[PDB]
Structures are given as C-alpha cells and as structure tokens.
Amino acid sequence: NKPCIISVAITGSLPRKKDNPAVPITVSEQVESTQAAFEAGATLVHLHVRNDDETPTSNPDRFALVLEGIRKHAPGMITQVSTGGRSGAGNERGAMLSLRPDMASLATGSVNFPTRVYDNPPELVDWLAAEMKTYGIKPEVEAFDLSMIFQAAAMQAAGAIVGPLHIQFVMGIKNAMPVDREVLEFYVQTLKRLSPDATWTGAGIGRHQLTMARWSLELGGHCRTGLEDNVRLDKNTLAPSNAALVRQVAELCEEYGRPVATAAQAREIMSLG
C-alpha cells in the first residue's frame, strides 16, 4: 500500500556503447534517456557524466547542461549527482555540488571493487558531506558494506548529515558485498536501531538488479534500476533503454501492491523541498 520510489542510474562510469548502444553518453542522450525513464515511473535520477570519447568525468559544466535539460524535460524529478571517482582523486569529486542538485551520492567508507579499491578517505567523506550541507543538498549514503551504515548514523548524530537519512544498500559487486537476503534484513534492522526515521533503497548490480528490487518492495524499501548497474533486460536480451528497465521495476510495484510514487510523493518520503 505504501508508495515506492524508483531511482534510475542512467550512465555510471564503466558502461560503454560497445556494452549496450542504449547507454546515454552525450548531453542530449542523457536528457532524452532520463525523460523516457521519468515517463516510465522513475522519480529520482542518479547522474554520472561522460566526456565525448565515453571516458568518465566530474566536469561541472557537463553536469550543468544535463541538470538544466532534466529540470525542463522531467519537471519535479529529483536530481542526484554522483560524487564517485578514481583512487587518488580528491575535492574534484565534489566540484559539481555548487550547481545545487536535490541530492548527491555519498560513500561513507572504502570497499574493494572488481579490479581496484573504491577509495573514500575519511577526510574526503567529511569534505563532501560539508559541501552538500553548504549547498542545501540531501546526501544519499552509499552503503557498500556494514560499517558504512554505522558511519552514516555517527555523522547524522554529530550533525555532519542533516535531516532523516536516506541510505542505499548496494549488493552484487565483485569483491564488495554479495547479494544476500539475511544481510539485507540485518542492514534494515541495524538502520532502524541507529536511525529510526531513515528511508532506504536496495540496489543490485548485474543479474541481481531485479532480485534487489523485489526484496526492497517486500521489506518496505525503495527501488533502483538503470544501465549503470545492469545493461541486460534478461540473460539473452540487452536493455533497449533505461525506461525499459524502469518498466520492469514498475511492473514489480503492481505485483507487490505498492503504487509507483509520483514526483511530489517521492520528495515527501525523502523530506525534500
């Protein structure tokens, strides 16, 4: 009965045109892919930007052009910029925050990724959180491991994160946290114990994208999909668009009796302006 927010991670930093031509790279491609996903039921856009040669970038000018197009073509949709980056990258990872999006991703710890370490030094975590506060941005805590939930709660208690927490439990990444029902249940129980008014989203990478969406719907959480996490619609078929992946989650919403949240409902659930 409770509405479900559908987040759409459109691009990411790894997916290329060779993996799936549906992956939006240019400003026009990202705006059109977001609008189609918004019309399919998505109310939150998780945004990574790319250079013309498909290489990842934190370029604030590229972010500004895409955010402007999203506000015009998908009105009311929650904008969420990514603060992800390579190992060794510092303040550059939060150079787009002054554009004042609705939200921004915040990894509160470090974790192993498939080929490298996803480095998030404590000094960088503190700086990114302080910048989001300065520009009135609501953080989305990216919890790639258990300790990151404790770090998020300790930061909220100290006043480093303002208002109710929104945390994303990420599962299915090689060398990080695998997709596990008992761990997700413990994640929710731990979040409830540390931060009772917090909201959460379950996120699955690859073939476990729909599995994490089903579990999130059952456990009273919210959903995330998109080409950033998975380029396949099923084992044999590539996803023709981000909107096609949003439709899969929207279909699961009707199956579990939870209505797809509107833009106004999504902002209310996560206590946004």
79 in contact with Zn ion (CB under 5 A): no
Please say which residue, 54 or 92, places its beta carbon nearer to its own copies. Answer: 92
d(CA 5, CA 272): 13
Q: What's CA 173's distance to the chain center, in Å?
A: 14
- Binding-site partner at residue 92 among Zn ion, its own copies, none, CB < 5 to 8 Å by type: none
- Binding-site partner at residue 177 among its own copies, Zn ion, none, CB < 5 to 8 Å by type: its own copies
What lies within 8 Å, CB to CB, of 126 at 6+ separation is 160
Residue written as token pair 């009273």 = 220
Site residues for its own copies, 189-228, by CB under 8 A, read 190, 193
d(CA 267, CA 199): 12
Binds its own copies (CB under 8 A): choice among 136, 147, 234, 251:
147
Inter-helix orientation angle 27-40/60-73, to 10°? 40
Please say which residue, 103 or 217, places its beta carbon nearer to Zn ion. Answer: 103
- Binding-site partner at residue 162 among Zn ion, its own copies, none, CB < 5 to 8 Å by type: none
175 in contact with its own copies (CB under 8 A): yes
Binds its own copies (CB under 8 A): choice among 109, 172, 204, 221:
109
Token pair listed for 142: 């990216």
Binds its own copies (CB under 8 A): choice among 64, 162, 183, 263:
183
- Bridge partners of 167, per DSSP, are 141, 200
Please say which residue, 113 or 127, places its beta carbon nearer to its own copies. Answer: 113
Burial environment of residue 164 by CB neighbours within 10 A (0 to 12, 13 to 18, 19 or more): middle
- Binding-site partner at residue 109 among Zn ion, its own copies, none, CB < 5 to 8 Å by type: its own copies
Binds its own copies (CB under 8 A): choice among 54, 92, 119, 218:
119
Sort residue 136 into left (φ over 0), alpha (ψ -120 to 50) or beta. Answer: left
